[PDB]
Design a protein around this nucleic acid. Structure first.
Ligand code: MG
Lengths: 448, 450
DNA sequence: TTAGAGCCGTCA
RNA sequence: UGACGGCUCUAA
């Protein structure tokens, strides 16, 4: 008997002052914001992966089709969408000298193997970026317990972007299973697979494809979400990571003070008030540094509810003009709103509000510009609530819908949850891999 | 007024670069005409030949990729283009925008290799500016560059094709409202009427034990069977709380606030579900953190209930619809169920390994969508219902909760495009004896293939 | 109440 | 060990 609400899809901004909702469609027509003419993206990997990479590069120039080419549009070619040259010759294409195949003796330690392989790639990148003079922008790694986080963790301290690919994804067509089937069948998503790789590798090569262009000045969509470390000796010890996000998407990241913020009995996550003031002030001072004016609002996002004493650790470091509200974001709570008739679920952008604080938002569904739903079955929404502070629920709903579209690791139409959450999720795990380094750098390239 | 560029391509066939090339061409400044770029009355007709190929064209572009030598559309316009070039007595009019690399040198249209061909097979980076430089050296007219029109015209092509439409319609929720509740809640405790060693989860009626404060919903004389010395007491000394006010939050005392009571009702409203699953004749599954309940094999009319196939066979395995319940009462006192699909080889014994259960679960729900899922959820609720209007969940000897079967209705504003038949795929109906008759052959063969 | 992990189809 | 979604099991 009640009534729903819909939010118009925020329009991102591309080069030449042109705004198109679809990141893939607008990019092809117009091009990225910053035209990095020199894309000298280096490659570091084994020879088989290198020629797999080399074969893939010329494939990037050629158009790559999706057998269903309305939901996952064309990928005409890197020089067409971006207007920046990229080939298999300008690369430095240094080779990982891993052809040694010999075993004097093994050991019953997978972590030692995991540490060995991760270490064997870090030094090779290090020995290259210092010796050379030409501007290598990426160091794609080829791979024939966890590897990616620590490989990025050690590389984090050296301030040099890196991407890891090609377990089976780059050459899936030939890299079939053991029974004559594609172990990762990309025949349906061949055109889309090259889309994300081209967009992501461009961004971490000094790029910045698109940024939002319908914002009100003076805002700051900081993202603060707790993480967990399973290797900490203290049972309650877990990492907290902040995340600065402006309209452009090129914010700053500060490692929060790790400490025992886990409560086994209460099942909640909160920090001491003293360091809460520093984390907000450090982030607040950084935004003032990059904008010269203090923000009129701080929509700090979170995924866990917070107490009041922590809130009182924010109301005093915030100037009188500034206002700050901490919105919690959850998705475990389900509300599947099946359509009355037809097999097509509700489009993304619809939202359910229950009060001035709690609300449901559907960021998934059949897109009215895609004729397809980004979810396998009927998609559940995200439960977002204004935990503390007073704000407008419609504004945060519209902004959180906008912030979901600004994802650069992937060129999908719109992420299900804000990048302030997912990007924080991976960087926290990277931090837990190597907590030694105090790494404050503005760039997200050494992270994503 | 001769400041236009003509594009010829196989509109229905696999020629889709004409869209992006035209947008860039109009983006760069050239006034480009294509089949798709003019979509308001048909697609292609004699009107293209009538005016623009004669009086309003400067270049003619052919997408000779796969069937340029064969398709009538490319050939019939090329015949017009060839003779209209002779009328102008020009030199460079038609351009062979070869696309497909597989088009061999010995397999090419005779009527196109008359003029030199720009190359697009290996990469566009050679071909994109090749049109540009050729236009400049041939003094092709150029409006000043502007990408505003490219964005504007891009929207118009795919505006009526697809966008959000403000037409009101309703949605069927996953939430089942509760409208009838017992008028009072009673807590029984003497610290000696029951011990703190026996299990309360196995009690005949919904009740659990806390460290110091006991909870239940029945009288003091309904728990003799589990352990004696309970019926002798009177109900006047029990702790009675009005249920109508225990949820609104108006009640609040020293022992528990209103919020502790909300968590207690949730525990009672959920633990009581398992007893109703011994009344409707369904099997129980030891699901993680919850319990999934599904109907047995062929219990209803040939594995289906109310013309809904709640039970079916996936090739070798048997799949059955099932749900797990959860009671939340924050926005309103409602019941929530999580849809589930449970597999069994035959029904006598379920599959021991959970990994195969989930992997098989993933494939089965892959070809499922909104209505195919919604109608199969409401079906498992109506059958579970003890009455047409609502279900009867027993919590007390003389008082039982009443949960409606029809979920709450939400109505929106934006649904989908005005024209119907969004996806015209697999709509015909043929005389078949079994569901997925020809479909299983397609699915099984593809698994063998890949 | 919340995380971490883990298989797996690619969106009628 | 491209990306998203989906549930599914794991404790605390
Ligand atoms: Mg990435």
């Amino acid at each position: 008997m009640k009534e729903l609400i819909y939010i118009e899809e925020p329009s991102i901004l591309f080069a030449h002052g042109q705004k198109c909702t679809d990141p893939r469609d607008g990019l092809a027509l117009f091009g990225p914001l910053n035209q990095i003419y020199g894309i000298k993206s280096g490659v570091v990997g084994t020879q088989k992966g290198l020629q797999i990479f080399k074969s893939y590069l010329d494939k990037i120039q050629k158009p790559i089709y999706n057998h269903n080419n309305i939901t996952r549009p064309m990928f005409p070619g890197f020089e067409a969408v971006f207007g920046c040259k990229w080939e298999s010759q300008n690369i430095v294409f240094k080779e990982i000298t891993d052809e040694e195949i010999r075993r004097y003796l093994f050991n019953a330690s997978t972590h030692k193997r995991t540490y060995d392989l991760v270490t064997l790639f870090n030094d090779k990148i290090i020995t290259a970026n210092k010796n050379d003079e030409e501007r290598v922008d990426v160091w794609f790694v080829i791979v024939p317990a966890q590897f990616h986080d620590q490989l990025k963790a050690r590389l984090l301290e050296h301030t040099i972007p890196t991407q890891i690919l090609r377990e089976s994804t780059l050459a899936w067509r030939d890299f079939k299973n053991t029974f004559g089937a594609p172990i990762r069948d990309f025949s349906k998503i061949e055109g889309h697979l090259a889309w994300t790789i081209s967009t992501a590798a461009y961004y971490k090569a000094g790029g910045k494809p698109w940024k939002l262009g319908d914002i009100r000045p003076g805002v700051c969509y900081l993202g603060l979400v707790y993480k967990k470390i399973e290797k900490s000796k203290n049972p309650q010890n877990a990492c907290c990571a902040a995340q600065m996000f402006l309209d452009n998407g090129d914010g700053t990241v500060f490692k929060g003070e790790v400490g025992p913020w886990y409560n086994p009995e209460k099942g909640e996550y909160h920090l001491k008030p003293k360091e809460a003031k520093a984390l907000l002030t450090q982030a607040l001072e950084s935004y003032k540094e990059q904008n010269k004016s203090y923000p009129k609002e701080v929509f700090i996002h979170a995924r866990t509810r917070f107490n009041d004493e922590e809130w009182n650790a924010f109301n005093e470091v915030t100037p009188k003009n500034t206002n700050l509200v901490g919105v919690t974001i959850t998705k475990s709570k389900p509300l599947k709103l099946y359509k009355t008739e037809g097999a097509f679920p509700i489009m993304r952008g619809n939202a359910y509000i229950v009060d001035e604080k709690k609300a449901f938002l559907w960021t998934l569904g059949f897109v009215p510009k895609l004729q397809s739903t980004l979810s396998m079955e009927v998609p559940n929404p995200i439960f977002i609530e204004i935990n503390k502070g007073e704000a407008e629920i419609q504004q945060v709903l519209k902004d959180i819908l906008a912030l979901t579209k600004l994802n650069y690791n992937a060129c999908i139409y719109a992420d299900g949850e804000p990048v302030t959450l997912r990007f924080a999720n991976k960087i926290g795990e990277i931090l837990t891999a190597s907590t030694e380094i105090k790494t404050p750098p503005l760039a997200f390239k050494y992270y994503i | 007024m001769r400041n236009k560029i003509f594009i010829s391509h196989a509109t229905p066939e696999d020629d889709d670069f004409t869209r992006w090339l035209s947008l860039k061409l109009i983006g760069l400044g050239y006034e480009v005409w294509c089949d798709i770029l003019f979509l308001d009355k048909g697609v292609d007709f004699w009107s293209t030949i009538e005016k623009e190929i004669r009086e309003n064209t400067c270049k003619f572009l052919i997408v000779s990729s796969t069937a340029g030598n064969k398709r009538e559309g490319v050939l019939k316009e090329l015949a017009v283009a060839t003779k209209v070039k002779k009328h102008l007595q020009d030199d460079m009019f038609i351009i062979p925008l070869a696309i497909d690399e597989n088009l061999s040198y010995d397999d090419i249209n005779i009527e196109i290799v008359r003029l030199n061909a720009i190359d697009f097979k290996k990469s566009w980076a050679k071909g994109l500016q090749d049109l540009l430089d050729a236009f400049e050296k041939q003094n092709v007219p150029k409006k000043p560059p502007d990408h505003s029109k490219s964005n504007l015209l891009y929207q118009q092509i795919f505006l009526h094709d697809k966008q959000a439409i403000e037409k009101e319609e309703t949605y069927d929720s996953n939430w089942f409202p509760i409208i009838s509740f017992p008028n009072e809640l009673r807590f029984h405790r003497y610290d000696w009427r029951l011990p703190k060693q026996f299990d309360v989860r196995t009690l005949a009626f919904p009740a659990i034990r806390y460290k110091e404060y006991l909870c239940t919903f029945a009288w003091e004389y309904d728990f003799i069977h589990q352990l004696p010395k309970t019926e002798t007491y009177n109900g006047q000394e029990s702790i009675r709380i009005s249920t109508s006010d225990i949820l609104s939050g108006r009640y609040d005392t020293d022992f528990i606030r209103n919020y502790e009571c909300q968590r207690l009702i949730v525990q009672l409203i959920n633990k009581a579900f398992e007893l109703r699953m011994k009344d409707k004749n369904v099997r129980e599954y030891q699901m993680s953190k919850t319990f999934a309940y599904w109907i047995e094999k062929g219990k209803l009319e040939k594995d289906k209930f109310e013309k809904i196939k709640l039970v079916g066979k996936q090739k070798n395995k048997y799949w059955h619809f099932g749900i797990s319940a959860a009671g939340k009462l924050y926005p309103s006192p409602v019941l929530m169920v999580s849809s589930h699909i449970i597999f069994t080889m035959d029904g006598i014994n379920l599959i021991k390994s959970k990994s195969i259960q989930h992997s098989s679960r993933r494939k089965q729900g892959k070809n499922w969508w909104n209505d195919k899922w919604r109608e199969k959820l409401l079906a498992f609720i109506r059958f579970l219902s003890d009455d047409q209007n609502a279900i009867y969940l027993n919590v007390g000897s003389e008082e039982k909760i009443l949960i409606s079967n029809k979920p709450l209705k939400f109505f929106g504003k934006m649904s989908y495009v005005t024209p119907s038949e969004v996806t015209l795929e697999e709509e015909s109906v043929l005389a078949d004896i079994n569901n997925f008759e020809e479909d299983t052959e397609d699915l099984d063969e593809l698994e063998d293939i890949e």
